[PDB]
A and B are shown apart, each in its own frame.
Chain A
Amino acid sequence: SVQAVQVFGKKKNATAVARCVQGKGLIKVNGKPLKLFAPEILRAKLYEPILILGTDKFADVDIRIRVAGGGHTSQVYAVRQAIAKSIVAYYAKYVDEHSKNLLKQELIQFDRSLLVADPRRCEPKK
């Protein structure tokens, strides 16, 4: 009955659950707002999907994120991955596939790591 989408985000050892529901427009990380949770210089890494997609896409959703593990940098990268993948999955399920494809195209044109986490394996020059 309720519109709800749960999306994970991943870095070295920092993981993020983001549940996106129908709402008024808030984004909370660990119960505190997104403008509070980061080091003061990496909030520009957090605001990257919102500024790519515009605020009109985030006008309708409410995203709640939990993070665990990692350091400050790994947790910030996990939060921005959870934000971007979360709004793309909500627009996949509950509005049109053309809007899903437009959001995916804008995010992939900026940075692919907002959608697909690339782990660093060990394969040096063999």
Chain B
Amino acid sequence: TVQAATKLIEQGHVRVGVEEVRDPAFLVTRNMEDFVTWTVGSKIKQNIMKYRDKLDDF
């Protein structure tokens, strides 16, 4: 939901491209919607990998 998304990008799990984004008003254009993804050491990313059973700890 948009409420959970604003909470997650205030806690700082989301980068857009190569730079982490802390501002929840960053206007994502049509060719950066292909580059928004999670950050490096993300606990949300570990949660997704632990769900899919691909949790590589390396």
Contact = CB atoms under 8 A, between A and B. Distances in A.
User: Within 8 Å by CB, do A and B touch in the complex?
Assistant: yes
Interface of A: 5-8, 85, 88-89, 92-93, 115
Interface in B1-58: 54-58
Contacts of A6: 55-57
Nearest 7 CB-CB pairings of A with B:
A89-B58, A89-B57, A5-B57, A85-B58, A8-B56, A7-B58, A6-B55
Contacts of B55: 6
A116 to B, nearest CB: 10
Contacts of B54: 8
A95 B48 CA distance: 26
Interface of B: 54-58
Contacts of A89: 57-58
A89 B56 CA distance: 9
A93 B56 CA distance: 12
A8 B55 CA distance: 8
Nearest to B55: A6
A32 B24 CA distance: 53
Contacts of A7: 56-58
A93 B57 CA distance: 9
A51 B14 CA distance: 42
A82 to B, nearest CB: 10
Contacts of A93: 57
Contacts of A8: 54, 56
A8 B58 CA distance: 9
A92 B54 CA distance: 18
Contacts of B57: 5-7, 89, 92-93
A93 B41 CA distance: 14
A92 B55 CA distance: 15
